[PDB]
Amino acid sequence: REEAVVWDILDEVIREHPVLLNRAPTLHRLGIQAFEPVLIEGKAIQLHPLVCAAYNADFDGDQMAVHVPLTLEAQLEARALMMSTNNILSPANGEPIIVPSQDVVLGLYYMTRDCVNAKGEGMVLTGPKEAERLYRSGLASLHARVKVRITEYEKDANGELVAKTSLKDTTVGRAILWMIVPKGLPYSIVNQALGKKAISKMLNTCYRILGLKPTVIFADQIMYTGFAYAARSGASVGIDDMVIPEKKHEIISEAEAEVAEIQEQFQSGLVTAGERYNKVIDIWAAANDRVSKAMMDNLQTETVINRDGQEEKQVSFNSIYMMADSGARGSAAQIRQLAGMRGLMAKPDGSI
Amino acid sequence: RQMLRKATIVNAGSSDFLEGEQVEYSRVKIANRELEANGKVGATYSRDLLGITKASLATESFISAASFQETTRVLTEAAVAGKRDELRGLKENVIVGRLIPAGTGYAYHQDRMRRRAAG
Amino acid sequence: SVTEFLKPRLVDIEQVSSTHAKVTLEPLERGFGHTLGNALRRILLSSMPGCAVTEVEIDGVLHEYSTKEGVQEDILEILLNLKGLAVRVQGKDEVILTLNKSGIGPVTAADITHDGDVEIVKPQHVICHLTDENASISMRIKVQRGRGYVPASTRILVDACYSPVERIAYNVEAARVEQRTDLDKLVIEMETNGTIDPEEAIRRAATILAEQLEAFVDLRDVR
Amino acid sequence: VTEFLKPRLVDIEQVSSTHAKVTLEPLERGFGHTLGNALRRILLSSMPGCAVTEVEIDGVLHEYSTKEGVQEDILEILLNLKGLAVRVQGKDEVILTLNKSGIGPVTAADITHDGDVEIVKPQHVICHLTDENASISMRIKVQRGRGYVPASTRIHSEEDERPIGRLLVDACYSPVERIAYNVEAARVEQRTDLDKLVIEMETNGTIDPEEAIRRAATILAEQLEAFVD
Amino acid sequence: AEIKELLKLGDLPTSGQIRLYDGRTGEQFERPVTVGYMYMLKLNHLVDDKMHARSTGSYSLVTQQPLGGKAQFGGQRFGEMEVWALEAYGAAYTLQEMLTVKSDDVNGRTKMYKNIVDGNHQMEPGMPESFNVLLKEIRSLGINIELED
Amino acid sequence: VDIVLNPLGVPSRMNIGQILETHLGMAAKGIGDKINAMLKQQQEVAKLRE
Amino acid sequence: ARVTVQDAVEKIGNRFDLVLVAARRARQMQVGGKDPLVPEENDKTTVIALREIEEGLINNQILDVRERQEQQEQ
Amino acid sequence: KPLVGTGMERAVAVDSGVTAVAKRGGVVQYVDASRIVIKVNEDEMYPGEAGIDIYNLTKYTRSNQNTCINQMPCVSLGEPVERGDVLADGPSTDLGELALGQNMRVAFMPWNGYNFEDSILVSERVVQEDRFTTIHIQELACVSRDTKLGPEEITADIPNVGEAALSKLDESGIVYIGAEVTGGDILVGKVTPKGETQLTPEEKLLRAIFGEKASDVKDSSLRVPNGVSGTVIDVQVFTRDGVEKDKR
């Protein structure tokens, strides 16, 4: 009859009974984890970015497997061993299994940045209402010279933490992210531009210092905070964001003449066909390297900003460049192909 | 450590005048014989590594390594030996459905092994 | 039915501290709960009455690059710690208070001249650092009454933290009523500045908004 | 409050019968953003209306089938006629009707005019006819709902009912379909510079702009009422 | 180039970046974004076969196992690599039940169903039927099947 | 707009074509909307023709 | 729920007997005849047994001693 | 219709032949939701020929991939068209294009984790207008199979059966076209006769009291699939020659 009272009964049962999930091709011990089951109104499974890479799927047409611990020993073991909330560090490399690799990294990066001097650049405060000074008005995560009294806590005493108040200047976003940060770590870690490897270092150090419980608290908080802040950014893409360096059109032309020169040698018979081929290959490689350098410089931190000096070469804001810098997605090698030449990329089977 | 086992011996050493005895078993025999009873019983052994394609046949449970690659000759040999699987390996306790001496069941199997002591 | 909307009945609120607390509500309409929470934040933050500290005339150089003169507190430091003091004007308008003490060093809230309508939530609130010797100084600070907040860069002179709160946010959770599961629940988590009951402040904000909008409903819900 | 200067409804301009740009009085700082956002949200949220809910037509038995003399499919009939919207009186769950023959285009006007409903535009589509001899006969039942009610959301309502010949379709049941905010600051000289928010509202024409705004405001007030407690 | 030009002819941003408003909190959005219309196609592999469950099924006449790929509420078969993974867990109860409860057990299936009804949470190992079947297959070919104690 | 696309995948597949699609679609939807708006005032045949 | 299990691992050390003790307590609670020494909050017997063991009240020796006392009292 | 394609879809449907080309036609004679009749002008009308063409497109034809192909008519009335003109609107086609898919508005931004790597965020809007709703037509069948224990015939006579099941069946046992179907609803009800009984005093009394079934006919009925529900679009039947049941 599909009774709603039955629905209530099932929800009462569904509370204290964990479940197991796994992906299609088992490759690691990371393929299957255990977690608290929560009903969702749909026709699919909902997965946090917690076990994502370990699941080795890719948000595409895929399947998962659910396992019901029937015996009490089964439940105890799964919450004890199969539970994802324990596979923190990768059993093989020793590094964290849970390595935040989604756009949350991009959001934390957008937290700790400073263009040159934004609105209220010289603002100095305590920090608690910095959430107002940013969210309401007054401050941006991209702001510089924001001085704040920082109440760090170092567990210098044997099994005991001691607080300390300073006047560290930073950006709005880094100091804000310091709020959800746990007590142990010094704020020097929070003084950065928040790249991906930086996130990795933060996670590992936190694992070293505190322990799994606050570590998981911080991890989830980082997930939520990134999912929020990066959303405040949007960070779209467009045709103009990729900028074509005009120098290649000259440099390549120069290399073109070089090839003709090599060709002329082949016409004179002085350069062997293999020798001419090697020379042309080296010339093309050098031209490619020069063009790649030119494209990088065009996409480097090369943008003049109006200010007292009015010539302030700061970090560029193009999606691809910043994402590669922090480490979000894509490759600088990928970018060069997309905007400069794709490279040699010549191999019928082995040849060039 | 898997790739090296079943050591070959040059001197019989009162153990056996053959080749291919488990290096661990050979050492165990040497310890239980040289130290306890016959120190003069020394079997000069030679350790050589083994390849995966063949070393798979080196198993102590007949159920194990049975379907390893083929079974026809394997089953023939197992019957010819009048051999007993003895329910020892992980695959053994699994296919048999015995509490493997692993995980929490290790102690249980150990307890079973404890029961295997008294009887 | 057509115009009936779900009202929240479970209003259980857990107080973490005298200022830190989180309340939660029963099912609000899907999307309506989120709108309610966002508007609650916008109103309760964009405008919040309270007496606050704005400007002082301390004994020494009017420039920020001044000397400690044995106070062992930078001018910015003493100013910020003074901003970290809860001055509530009962009925008094912008008034002035001054302080002077011996050279103990412990700069608590008991040194300044006591007023009737002026009240301090914290008798141990820090104002400046420990003096180096028996030297004193004249505060000559003033406290005003206002709503919301204002930067001191524009309006002269330390700050305008007229809102007597610390932090607040709303979290939206989902649930089912009986079977339909598109049910929204708003749970606020807020630390207060102090001297203000979060329940009383919330009720005051609700009344403020209701009065601010009552002219629009065209005297709706007459009977 | 300290002279909170509450805004009020004023300067309401009707761009069209279903396109409107209305104004309000100026308000104090910080409310205009909240006012406009909450207004757009609540207005789009719950605008009760009347629409076609179940169809019982003499001709077809299976709507996935064709019909001689008629051009559009029966599913096409359901789609185009789903464009039927009409003002409804206090009466709800009514049965309007429409039956006609001929060779001209079929318009919404050829519907049985009852005393509790009003068709906004004679220009909707009723599957314009093709042959002289054919005669379409239908009676459309209209219900009053607040939002989109799924086709199988109404499935459980009929246990022994709903014979082959009476069928259900989906709807929106919300004549709002547009509510947007634009806050400016003007007409403030005697006091501090206040802000007036203009609301762009393009309803289905079923609900009046001011009436709908008032209903939404009453809903919001009812909501905020518990918030004090 | 002609696209960006016609954007001006369409009175639209040639760059395409445009203001955005967050429907959840109503903040003017940073990073003016370029938005548009894109085509999208729905591919065959719809959900209409995705969802799949099972609670209690029938055993086969031979090997007494579950059905398969949604054939009569069928159920898929686990993986040997997954079995190795399960061993890597060292979850003896889990693997034991998987080889017992989620396997060909008939008389153990009934006992377990009765226990689950009674809330006993116990599985009885016994010996797999496939074991005796393979023993017979040995006896079926030219070798006696005899198991010592 | 009813579709908010995950944008972070833009680089790792050189899907510039998606961006070209975004631009072309914005322009074309604009052209159609403008023509329909011209129709809303029941504009003349010669004017819409030009 | 109790997301991560580290306290029980430290209380046991071998990490394989901790689950055994938890399951032994859980089966005994499910069958009956025992009372939870920790204040339950309408949860599964597994979580309650895990909490009681981690509280420093249930061990492989406490349960054995209690069982021996119960058997001898018959 | 596909807004920005590659220019080919016209021909890609033209030569594909899921639509109808106007073979030697000059103007439209009759247009119908089941066919189109076109009168051929005398210039191209063959002598002694009707000068009329009837293209009877078939809606709701269950094609190879279990999809739902239903060719639609292009013209409305009296449309003058020359030879080979696109006359039929085919599946995923619109006035002659490979109309494969929906042109939906989108914007570029990540947000709130719901668009983590390869996710698309369709709000309630495209649910409302329900663009991209899927169509399908799926079939089933049954057989009579005159048997040794007794022929199974579609008589809707199901002994020991609930009445509501028969509420949708015909005297033939068929279901009338246009019905709704959910669950395991009986589809084609045959009754396979079983081995005859003796005097059988218990069974004799059973036939005396209730009778007419005697468990002689065992349920040889067809029922709707489990977890597949719908509405009966169309039916067909083929009986071995010499068998003239033809009830419905």
Place this chain on the structure above:
Amino acid sequence: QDLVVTEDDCGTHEGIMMTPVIEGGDVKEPLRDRVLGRVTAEDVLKPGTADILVPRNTLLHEQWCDLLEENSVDAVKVRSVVSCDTDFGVCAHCYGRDLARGHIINKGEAIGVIAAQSIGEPGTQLTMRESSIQVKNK
């Protein structure tokens, strides 16, 4: 299929010395992690003569690593697999924790199970194919 932890201590001084991999141009893999979670033999001693850095059986949790980095020692003899005298698998004194369990691997730990999926994990490999002397530093 048979590898698992069965013994605690090997009681055998036999082991292998681990040194930084200074191969090619420079050190590809420093012996800071190569023995990071290792438990050496009695071969741990300070660079000074008659100066000892660590005892026989001890695992470098985190602090001996930097101290030995100050000691400028390259190779240390530690007990290893098989080298652990247990006659079946190996003793725990030559396995370490090397996993998310900061506590050492426990008795019954199927290290071979722990391994043997580990080796093949990178299923992303590539396939289908005296005169010049330069000094790096002083």
